[PDB]
Amino acid sequence: VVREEDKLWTVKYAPTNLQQVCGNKGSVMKLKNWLANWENSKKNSFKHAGKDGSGVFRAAMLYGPPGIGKTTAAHLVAQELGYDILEQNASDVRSKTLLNAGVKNALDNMSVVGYFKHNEEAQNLNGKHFVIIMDEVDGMSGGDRGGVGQLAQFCRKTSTPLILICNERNLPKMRPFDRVCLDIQFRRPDANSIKSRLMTIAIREKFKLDPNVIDRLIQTTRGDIRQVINLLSTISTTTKTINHENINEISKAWEKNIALKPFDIAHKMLDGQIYSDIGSRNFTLNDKIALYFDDFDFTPLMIQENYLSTRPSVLKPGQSHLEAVAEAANCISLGDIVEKKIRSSEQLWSLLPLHAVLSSVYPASKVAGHMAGRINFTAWLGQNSKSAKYYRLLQEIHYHTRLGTSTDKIGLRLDYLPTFRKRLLDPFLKQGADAISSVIEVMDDYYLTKEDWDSIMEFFVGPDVTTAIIKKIPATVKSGFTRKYNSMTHPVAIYRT
Amino acid sequence: TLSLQLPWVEKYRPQVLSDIVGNKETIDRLQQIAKDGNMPHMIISGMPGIGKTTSVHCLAHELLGRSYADGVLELNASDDRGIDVVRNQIKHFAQKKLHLPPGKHKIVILDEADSMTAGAQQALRRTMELYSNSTRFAFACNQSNKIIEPLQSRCAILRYSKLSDEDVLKRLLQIIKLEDVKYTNDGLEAIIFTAEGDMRQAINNLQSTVAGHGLVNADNVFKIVDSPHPLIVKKMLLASNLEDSIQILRTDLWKKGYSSIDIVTTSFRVTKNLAQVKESVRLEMIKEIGLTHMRILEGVGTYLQLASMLAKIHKLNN
Amino acid sequence: SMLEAKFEEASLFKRIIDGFKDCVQLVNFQCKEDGIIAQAVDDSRVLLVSLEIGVEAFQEYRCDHPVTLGMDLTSLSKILRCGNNTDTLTLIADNTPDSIILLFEDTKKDRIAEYSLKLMDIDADFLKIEELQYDSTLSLPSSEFSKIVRDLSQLSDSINIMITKETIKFVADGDIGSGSVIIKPFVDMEHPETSIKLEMDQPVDLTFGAKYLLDIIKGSSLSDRVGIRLSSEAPALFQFDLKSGFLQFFLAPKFN
Amino acid sequence: EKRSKENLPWVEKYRPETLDEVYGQNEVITTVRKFVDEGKLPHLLFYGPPGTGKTSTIVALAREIYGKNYSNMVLELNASDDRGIDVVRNQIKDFASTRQIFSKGFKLIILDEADAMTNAAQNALRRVIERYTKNTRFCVLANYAHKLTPALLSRCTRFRFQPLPQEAIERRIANVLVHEKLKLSPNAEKALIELSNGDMRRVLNVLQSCKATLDNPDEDEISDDVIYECCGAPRPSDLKAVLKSILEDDWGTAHYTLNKVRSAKGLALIDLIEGIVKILEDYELQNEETRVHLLTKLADIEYSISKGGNDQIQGSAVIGAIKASFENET
DNA sequence: AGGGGGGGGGG
DNA sequence: GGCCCCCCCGGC
DNA sequence: CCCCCCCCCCTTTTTTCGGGGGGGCC
Ligand SMILES: Nc1ncnc2c1ncn2[C@@H]1O[C@H](COP(=O)(O)OP(=O)(O)OP(O)(O)=S)[C@@H](O)[C@H]1O
Ligand SMILES: Nc1ncnc2c1ncn2[C@@H]1O[C@H](COP(=O)(O)OP(=O)(O)OP(O)(O)=S)[C@@H](O)[C@H]1O
Ligand SMILES: Nc1ncnc2c1ncn2[C@@H]1O[C@H](COP(=O)(O)OP(=O)(O)OP(O)(O)=S)[C@@H](O)[C@H]1O
Ligand SMILES: [Mg+2]
Ligand SMILES: [Mg+2]
Ligand SMILES: [Mg+2]
């Protein structure tokens, strides 16, 4: 019914069997082996893992860059094994409420279509068994509520094979799928794994395609077979020859733009080539600002973290590394002030471009060069979380001892805590278990608890660390102290905290 | 006095692909696809007012003939394009059974797709993939980076270039001949110079002139159309002496009604895109302009601040 | 217009449509000189709906050539809801049909309502349903079957039907106890409608989900007696007898 | 309003009702008159600073096009109203796609102060403008062009409202004097124009304050002294004396002169700095770095004053900055 | 930039 | 159909 | 089974109003 010359080249030349899939052979073999031994694992209750390690996972998580052939490979492996494909995609609502009334029934139930289609067939034991394919898991948005958790629970209480397909795996939303599926990673096909297919397509479509320029096309499409096929289809409409005379124009016109990751952004921005006289004409200031804007919530942190681990090559005659570092730090402080002004009540987001220069571009322009080591992710977030937790515990302690002390939390930390340590930790190290009564009396006088004790002893830094001292305390003393604390009533300062 | 006349932008909006000027290779490719059918999924990107919406509309009209009404689904930023809309209405249109000539397909035109949310774009993927034998997708956007990578992978790329002076000039002669407008060479040159490659602005200026003064000349065009202020800002920033820059700012910017915030923003952009100046000097000037912008945003939008910024920039470039 | 099928009352058509509207979303109708046939496959690929209506149900039926129509439950249900239940309902389809015409005719108030329903393109070919040698055959009234299904669905999410010698048991062991209902063949002369009949051949023990049974029993008001055919390993056939034609549900059993 | 128009402020009492009462925008007024006289009225973008008469001009244009009952035949939306994506999608689209009610005519939409609108609404308005152009026209009034998306700017014909020229302000002042039966000295007029900076609202407010200040307006003439007393602005003579003392006299006498001048009439330091800047802008300096230092230090002092602080220290800093900058002259 | 991992060639 | 609530961009 | 090029891919979360979208109660 459908004419053979009226279909997209991607569908017309789609692989018919797994043997025609180009690239990522190892992943294909692994997936085929996993799908060919699922029954044995089920009979073993997914307990006896095999040599390949695929005998314990009842679900598969396929991931890779777009346009590599994950969906096609999954569909072909499902078809060749005789299973019945049930596909759930991003165009179907996959919220928790809808999923609870949907695929749950099919996860542990035979297919009627398979029974009524393979009834006359023989040895097709897999024709009546469902295989679930969840395509574009990353495509779930606020429109799908609680889908990730439902899928994570599905991957462990599933009675039928399940295959998940996604484009981004490092995203935090994939955290629940960390250790519940067999991870299959697909790479960008090489220029030699698709040469024969592309030459065959060119011969069939009656347009000349010079082999010597093939690689650049992939370099232009960056591992996207679908994109290069579409490029060929579009160019062949009016241009019947693809040679070195016009390869540059099409490569420039069809260049794919993908936002760089924070690590890649930091690596590129801290390179001295782009800041040279010749590099600046290629990678301009606008290009650097766009690179910053690719991820404006992480770039300044990465720059501030990784600007001390470079070997600058753009140092001014007579300038030292330390002077450039100081200038970069001053610019970073100015950018921090600008950022604080940006996120104020006025919401001056129009200053974001300025923050690009004062936080990322300018400080990097003074220490640009070659990294002296591996790029490290910013550690400021963990430090901020730890400081917030410490401040919360300090506030709790201060308001627990407010009725007895005349000071603030800052004064409590800076002045009171050492004196308190002199009474709540020191006498355990001298009198052994005979200091329990005095410590309990102090706690009662200042309305302190055991959790408050742990929080207070955890604040100290420098040569007054208490972790080793606390650990070296005999276990009998600690047990006796706990028993004494739990064997009597204590006053409470704040009620219904 | 209440019978409005159709503006020349809509009156002379091209209806065939042969009336579109500029981007010759893409226009001939579109014409060939329309003649031979089999229109693939496409994404057309470019700056405003270059003929993307017109191009897609002409392509769809020529392809579908009389079936345009029942075979074209057009959605833009002025219509609801939420995730539910994509999941229900677009799916219904794609699954619709419409008898068409053998070489034609249903067309969905999502204009201004750069404003669509990520969820709708993600949901559209399998909708285009599964129903590619009956329905095809043509997106028109201003910024290509706002479209998710999978959609670009499934679609061809058509990046429209900037309209050359010759093409705009030729279209102007054609429209003037059609309207029988008395013109002079200098007036047309001024109109094209002020248009900066925007055909719509050129048509608007050409209508406003003649509609207000009759004959087209440099003076008539310039008394209603002002020279782009970015050029004046660049001239001020490149002045050899501080006195010249101050005079330019006072005469062409401050006394003409331009606001300080606009002036500082334009200076920021111009310094961002100044190739002749060294990158380090550009960064210092950007820092100074940002300081001035922060001062202005706090309330002190005075000519004194702009003069101080110009003086500091001159000191830096000395 | 080769296809013209007239129902004296739209109520019959509405009752036919809504009986399987809540289990499927896309349906395919084949219109032939012998009547109407229809097939529907649920999204989960577990429950299959078959339907046919003979020429007796139509006061007028003309079909020069066989045709096919792809329909969606939501739009058809909305269009039917627009019309009343006491007007003649005419379905009209022309050659190369991209849409169907629904005519609501009221001959007392002289009222004509024309609706156009756009057809859908469905690739799925019809599954060849072949007469199965069902081991167990049962025929019971619709009312108590619906009652038992609804009551047992509240205790478990999947119930087991066991057919043995003069015994039909509905085990509903789950979260709430293990309540079950056991019935035996019974014949009433005064009330032939309530006649449980058993054609025991071989023991049967098949587990079926609660949601599919709940959706299927929704058609209990449509018919009077429901016929349940079970086999050793095959989908249960729930036959709903019609005045002319019938409505069949195929339900695939759960594994083990 | 309440009672009569005499109770209204002069800024609102003298609001133009027709197009011929708008002064200082002859080119724009003539262009719009020609447009509305022959049916070719395109989409308008009135860009200009405050107090130029954009709102008055558009109101007069609407009145001329439609007549007395123009309020019921136009859709006026401003920053005071909620203008979101939903509003643009529903209300504006319905207004543009629907016929008139009271009388036959085209639909007019006035989006005053559109620079305070979100980017989503501006993006949505593009197709609304380009689809109903046959029967609807759009007018957008703005003070800052950077807040408008390029797509919106491309679809509108731009008209710039310049600061009011001297002659227009004189004519309006004469009309106001005739209406209010008031007399103004020529020097007072020159001072009013100098302090006006092209804003008619300032003219009207200062004139009303001066009239209220007079003991008896019937036979009293407003002079420059009255204007200075009402506005509290420094007199040119005081500015000249302060600058002379700073430039030639020593530290102690310059400080004494500045303090005496400020305390004589309670003058503010920022106005003195502004006047000194205006005076020195015309000085034929022989060196550039002197002007650079003057501008930078005076801008720093103005920024510091804007946030408050010690006034005496700020004045001493002004004196020291001027002296140091002029030291470079040699 | 540093380290881990997959696939073609040599052994 | 209407609140109420939660998550997410924000420059050119 | 063991070793050597050639390249690809991963090393990772906090944020001040105002507006928009999309889900859940009712
Ligand atoms: N290994 C491959 N060999 C040949 N063609 C391929 C290959 N991979 C993809 N294609 C072609 O691209 C078309 C679509 O491939 P897809 O399977 O949809 O890509 P994908 O990996 O699923 O990327 P996303 O996540 O759907 S954007 C196929 O019909 C093929 O024509
Ligand atoms: N290549 C062109 N040739 C002739 N006229 C053009 C051309 N491009 C634009 N115009 C004219 O300008 C008018 C508007 O063109 P548009 O199609 O709206 O530009 P656009 O690029 O689609 O604007 P955006 O990106 O949606 S804001 C047309 O009706 C034409 O009259
Ligand atoms: N050209 C003018 N001629 C006479 N009076 C004017 C003129 N312009 C402004 N005014 C006077 O100042 C008052 C306010 O004018 P407006 O129309 O509000 O200025 P505006 O440009 O709309 O202010 P913005 O840009 O919205 S802050 C008018 O009522 C007039 O009394
Ligand atoms: Mg795919
Ligand atoms: Mg457009
Ligand atoms: Mg106004």
Q: How far is CA B140 from the centre of its chain?
A: 12
Half-sphere exposure of C115 (CA within 13 A, CB side): 18
Of B3, B255, B298, the CB nearest to D39: B3
Question: What does each C-alpha distance from D305 to B147, C1, D300, D314, D316 come to in angstroms?
Answer: 48, 87, 9, 7, 13
The residues facing C31 across adjacent strands are C36, C67
Torsion of CA C38, C41, C46, C52, to 10 degrees: 0
Q: How far is CA D218 from the centre of its chain?
A: 30
Residue-range domain boundaries for chain C: 1-256
> D285 burial class (0-12, 13-18, 19+ CB within 10 angstroms)?
middle
Same-domain pairing of D61 and D179:
no
Q: What is the 3-state secondary structure (H, E, C) of chain B?
A: CCCCCCCHHHHCCCCCHHHCCCCHHHHHHHHHHHHHCCCCCEEEECCCCCCHHHHHHHHHHHHHHHHHHHHEEEECCCCCCCHHHHHHHHHHHHHECCCCCCCCCEEEEEECHHHCCHHHHHHHHHHHHHCCCCEEEEEEECCHHHCCHHHHHHCEEEECCCCCHHHHHHHHHHHHHHHCCCCCHHHHHHHHHHHCCCHHHHHHHHHHHHHCCCCCCHHHHHHHCCCCHHHHHHHHHCCCCHHHHHHHHHHHHHCCCCCHHHHHHHHHHHHHCCCCCCHHHHHHHHHHHHHHHHHHHCCCCCHHHHHHHHHHHHHHCC
What are the E-state strand segments in chain C?
A: 3-7, 26-32, 35-41, 47-54, 60-63, 67-72, 88-93, 99-106, 111-118, 136-141, 158-164, 167-171, 180-183, 197-198, 204-209, 225-230, 236-241, 245-251
Largest CA-CA distance found in chain B, in angstroms, rounded: 73
A375 CA: nearest nucleotide by C1': E1
Based on the structure, what is the number of domains in chain D?
Answer: 3
Euclidean distance between CA atoms D236 and D275, whole angstroms: 8
Largest CA-CA distance found in chain C, in angstroms, rounded: 60
Q: What separation in Å is there between the alpha carbon of A148 and the centre of ligand 1?
A: 25
Same-domain pairing of D117 and D180:
no
Please measure the distance between the N-terminal and C-terminal CA atoms of chain A and give it in whole angstroms: 74
CA of C99 vs chain A CAs: smallest distance (Å): 19
The DSSP symbol for A44 reads T
Torsion of CA C245, C246, C252, C256, to 10 degrees: -120
Q: Which nucleotides in chain F lie less than 7 Å from some protein C-beta?
A: 6-12
Helix-helix angle A25-36:A70-80, to 10 degrees: 40
Torsion of CA B33, B37, B42, B45, to 10 degrees: 40
Angle at CA of residue A136, ends A134 and A140, nearest 5°: 100
Euclidean distance between CA atoms D44 and D32, whole angstroms: 10
CB proximity list for D220: less than 8 A, separation 6 or greater: D183, D214
CA nearest to C222, candidates C1, C19, C13, C65? C19
Burial A461-473 (b: 16+ CB within 10 A, else e): eeeeebeebbeeb
Annotated binding-site residues of A for ATP read: 10, 22, 64-72, 167
Structure tokens at B198: 């925007």
Amino acid whose CA is nearest the C1' of G10:
A170
Helix-helix angle D311-327:D269-280, to 10 degrees: 10
Question: What does each C-alpha distance from B5 to A197, B209, D42 come to in angstroms?
Answer: 58, 15, 9
Same-domain pairing of D12 and D116:
yes
**Sign of CA pseudo-dihedral D222, D225, D230, D231:** positive
Q: Which residues of B touch C (CB under 8 A)?
A: 92, 95-99, 134
CB proximity list for B195: less than 8 A, separation 6 or greater: B168, B201, B202, B205
Euclidean distance between CA atoms C94 and C62, whole angstroms: 12
CA nearest to B111, candidates B135, B81, B154, B82? B81
Torsion of CA A391, A397, A398, A402, to 10 degrees: 160
Domain boundary among D201, D233, D265: D233
- Secondary element (H or E) of residue A11: helix A9-12
Neighbouring CB atoms inside 10 A of C111's CB total 11
Structure tokens at A404: 């007895």
Burial B283-305 (b: 16+ CB within 10 A, else e): bbbbbbbbbbbbbbbeebebbbb
A107 φ/ψ angles, rounded to the nearest 5 degrees: -65, -30
Domain boundary among D164, D199, D223: D164
SS3 D111: strand
Same-domain pairing of D6 and D139:
yes
> C186 burial class (0-12, 13-18, 19+ CB within 10 angstroms)?
exposed
Euclidean distance between CA atoms A30 and A184, whole angstroms: 8
In sequence order, what DSSP letters do the residues of A295-354 get, joined into one string? TTTTHHHHHHHHTTSEEES-PPTT--HHHHHHHHHHHHHHHHHHHHHHTSTT--GGGHHH
Euclidean distance between CA atoms D270 and A43, whole angstroms: 89
The residues facing C113 across adjacent strands are C104
Neighbouring CB atoms inside 10 A of D19's CB total 20
Strands across the sheet with D44-47, in order? D74-77, D107-111, D136-142, D44-47, D157-160
Structure tokens at C76: 């058809």
Structure tokens at C116: 């156009």
What are the E-state strand segments in A22-138?
A: 59-63, 84-88, 130-134
CB D295 within 8 Å of CB D322: no
- Rg value, chain A, Cα: 32
SS3 C196: strand
CB C80 within 8 Å of CB C17: yes
Helix-helix angle D186-196:D200-213, to 10 degrees: 140
- Which single residue is written with the structure tokens 């299927």? C216
Please measure the distance between the N-terminal and C-terminal CA atoms of chain C and give it in whole angstroms: 51
Same-domain pairing of D150 and D181:
no
The residues facing D184 across adjacent strands are D222
- Which single residue is written with the structure tokens 């999608």? D89
The DSSP symbol for A462 reads G
Q: Parallel, antiparallel, or unpaired: how do β-strands A59-63 and A162-166 relate? A: parallel
The residues facing C228 across adjacent strands are C138, C238
Range list of H helices, D38-111:
54-66, 85-87, 93-97
The DSSP symbol for C104 reads E
Instruction: Give B92's contacts in chain C (Cβ within 8 Å).
Output: 72
CB C87 within 8 Å of CB C106: yes
Residue B301 beta carbon below 6 angstroms from any ligand 2 atom: no
Torsion of CA C140, C143, C149, C153, to 10 degrees: -170
Q: How far is CA A244 from the centre of its chain?
A: 40
Range list of H helices, chain D:
10-13, 26-37, 54-66, 85-87, 93-97, 119-131, 150-154, 166-180, 186-196, 200-213, 224-231, 236-248, 251-265, 269-280, 288-306, 311-327
In sequence order, what DSSP letters do the residues of A365-415 get, joined into one string? HHS-EEESS------HHHHHHHHHHHHHHHHHHHHHSTTT--S-HHHIIII
Give the number of the atom of ligand 3 that is nearest the alpha carbon of residue D161. Answer: 21
CA nearest to B4, candidates C201, A195, A138, D66? D66
SS3 D274: helix
Ligand with minimal distance to B13 CA: 2
Q: Which of D55, D170, D179, D206 to mutate to test the pocket of ligand 3 (most atoms within 8 A of CB)?
A: D55
Range(s) of the domain holding residue D58: 1-164
CB D121 within 8 Å of CB D28: no
Euclidean distance between CA atoms A353 and A360, whole angstroms: 11
- Asked if B28 has any chain A CB less than 8 Å from its own CB, the reply is yes
Question: What does each C-alpha distance from C133 to A338, C39, C123, C137, C140 come to in angstroms?
Answer: 81, 22, 30, 10, 20
The residues facing A125 across adjacent strands are none
Structure tokens at D127: 């197709």
Euclidean distance between CA atoms B122 and B150, whole angstroms: 8
Residue A380, CB, less than 7 Å from strand F?
no
Question: What does each C-alpha distance from C172 to C153, C158, C178 come to in angstroms?
Answer: 8, 7, 6
Same-domain pairing of D5 and D94:
yes
Same-domain pairing of D36 and D53:
yes
Half-sphere exposure of A491 (CA within 13 A, CB side): 13
The DSSP symbol for C198 reads E
CB A405 within 8 Å of CB A467: no
Euclidean distance between CA atoms A322 and D192, whole angstroms: 58
Question: What does each C-alpha distance from A34 to A11, A31, A157, D174 come to in angstroms?
Answer: 27, 5, 18, 94
Range list of H helices, chain C:
10-18, 73-82, 142-153, 210-216
Angle at CA of residue D115, ends D113 and D116, nearest 5°: 85
Euclidean distance between CA atoms B164 and B171, whole angstroms: 11
- Which single residue is written with the structure tokens 């960064």? B283
Same-domain pairing of D318 and D272:
yes
Same-domain pairing of D186 and D210:
yes
Please give the single-letter amino acid code of residue A363. P
Domain boundary among D198, D213, D233: D233
Neighbouring CB atoms inside 10 A of C255's CB total 13
Structure tokens at D270: 């920022």
Structure tokens at A183: 């991870």
CA of B92 vs chain C CAs: smallest distance (Å): 8
Q: Which of residues 206-245 of D touch B (CB under 8 A)?
A: none
> A191 burial class (0-12, 13-18, 19+ CB within 10 angstroms)?
middle
Euclidean distance between CA atoms B73 and B93, whole angstroms: 8
In sequence order, what DSSP letters do the residues of C202-229 get, joined into one string? S-EEEEEEHHHHHHHGGGGGT-SEEEEE
Euclidean distance between CA atoms B273 and B267, whole angstroms: 10
- Secondary element (H or E) of residue A187: none
- Which single residue is written with the structure tokens 């919530």? A297
Half-sphere exposure of A49 (CA within 13 A, CB side): 7
CB proximity list for C168: less than 8 A, separation 6 or greater: C138, C161, C162, C182, C183, C184, C196, C198
Euclidean distance between CA atoms B77 and D128, whole angstroms: 9
Give the number of the atom of ligand 1 that is nearest the alpha carbon of residue A136. Answer: 25
Question: What does each C-alpha distance from C139 to C145, C196, C249 come to in angstroms?
Answer: 10, 6, 15
- Rg value, chain B, Cα: 24
Q: Which of residues 66-95 of A touch B (CB under 8 A)?
A: 66-67, 89-93
CB D1 within 8 Å of CB D8: yes
CB A83 within 8 Å of CB A126: yes
- Secondary element (H or E) of residue D22: none
- Which single residue is written with the structure tokens 């948005």? A141
Same-domain pairing of D122 and D226:
no
Euclidean distance between CA atoms B128 and A90, whole angstroms: 12
Structure tokens at A373: 């080591």
Angle at CA of residue A121, ends A120 and A126, nearest 5°: 125
Euclidean distance between CA atoms B275 and A277, whole angstroms: 11
CB D272 within 8 Å of CB D257: no
Please give the single-letter amino acid code of residue A6. D
Please give the single-letter amino acid code of residue B264. V
Interface contact C118-B95, CB threshold 8 A: no
CB C174 within 8 Å of CB C156: yes
Same-domain pairing of D209 and D261:
no
Structure tokens at D17: 């009702």
CB B68 within 8 Å of CB B56: no
Structure tokens at A460: 């100290």
